[PDB]
Amino acid sequence: MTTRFKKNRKKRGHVSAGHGRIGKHRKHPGGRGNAGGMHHHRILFDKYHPGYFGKVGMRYFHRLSNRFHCPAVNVERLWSMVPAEAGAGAGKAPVIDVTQFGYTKVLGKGMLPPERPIVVKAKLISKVAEKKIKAAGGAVLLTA
Amino acid sequence: MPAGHGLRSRTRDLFARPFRKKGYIPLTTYLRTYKVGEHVDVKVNGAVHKGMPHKFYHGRTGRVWNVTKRAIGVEINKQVGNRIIKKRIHVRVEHVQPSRCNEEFLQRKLNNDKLKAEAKARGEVISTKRQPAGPKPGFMVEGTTIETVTPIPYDVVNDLKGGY
């Protein structure tokens, strides 16, 4: 059988949720909210990839710790940081380095696995209760 | 009318007892407690009204898998139709009978191995049976449990019974 509307099956993806069954994710409300306005984005990278690219990250200066072991501001290591509201460091998988990471947010089990002598650094915007008191100073970076 | 499985429907052995089994059952059955890997029948006493499975299960032999308080979980496999899975049944010991066949067997195994030890220190029969056993690596079991519960979802009886 065919007319491809008698064996086909059917026309548009319905009889499928209501009364026949399988498939979509189906039957909805449910949360909805926030709008298209006050919305995303928070950029997030786990500290094991900065540890990939410590040795090859030779645009980030080494300093008080040995030459492998670098201060690096993570805001200027995260692709698509500039259209994001803040850059956060996530805590998965090891760090075997003596780094100094600068972030706009850090996890609590994000400092803790690279406790292994570190200085974990808030940027001014991490607070974010820090004084843009008309004044002058600090800023967010911009690039494509 | 659609078919079902009226869980209570057709029940005469499954709830009636012979003349010789009527009246209250002695509490020793109610008291009996089993160990894991015991083989036990499921077959209701009809004169106990609670802790029963759903009646279709009766006359199947199961393995005691684990226990929850008062009633026990016994593992069984359903039968006939298509692709059928192992299922676990919650039953109190009032409907669950120890297998005498399995005790007899356990005994017949020991008898066999008393002889195996005797006949391998001064005796001869077989030879070939001595060559397998001695090699083996063992043991227990749940790989081969999944092996069991995949062909008993049976093949050719399923297609044979799938049209008529």
Binding site: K24, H25, G51, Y52, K55, I96 | -
Partner: protein, 163 residues
């Protein structure tokens, strides 16, 4: 005749040279194994052959990590047989040595293994200098791993219960 024997015609037929290997250099490699296999001791090369015919559901990425814990000096730095390819994903200061043999590696993996020790070997140089294919570890898959068995379709797919 029987019905049994008809079912006997219905076994497999697994058999395949894959539809294309567009790479000529793979295409010659996949034949070589049926001449060499029945002509040496090498069961391993005979296994690699099936797995470099048939499928993409079969062709392996192996990470330097997935070599690295798994080779760990207690089969003492043998020759590691990776049917498909190595991938570059680890930093430890990686492998304890190593002779790794594969169809393909990435350039970063090629660079990092040879500056740890041994050689990143190609499978043909392996067939020349290890024709017996013994003291060798077949390491490994995957497509059999976490993502994706039957976990397809949209939003999936699940332990199961239902899907």
């Amino acid at each position: 005749m029987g019905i049994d024997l008809v079912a006997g015609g219905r076994n497999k037929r697994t058999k395949r040279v894959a539809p294309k290997s567009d790479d000529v250099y793979l295409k010659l490699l996949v034949k070589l194994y049926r001449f060499l296999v029945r002509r040496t001791k090498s069961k391993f090369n005979a296994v690699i052959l099936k797995r470099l015919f048939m499928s993409k559901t079969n062709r392996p990425p192996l990470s330097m990590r997935r070599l690295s814990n798994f080779m760990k000096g207690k089969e003492e730095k043998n020759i590691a047989v990776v049917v498909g390819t190595i991938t570059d994903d680890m930093r430890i200061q990686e492998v304890p040595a190593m002779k790794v043999t594969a169809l393909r590696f990435t350039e970063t993996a090629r660079a990092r293994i040879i500056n740890a020790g041994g050689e990143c070997l190609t499978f043909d140089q392996l067939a020349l200098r290890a024709p017996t294919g013994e003291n060798t570890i077949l390491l490994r898959g995957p497509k059999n791993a976490r993502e994706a068995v039957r976990h397809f379709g949209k939003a999936p797919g699940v332990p199961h219960s239902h899907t």
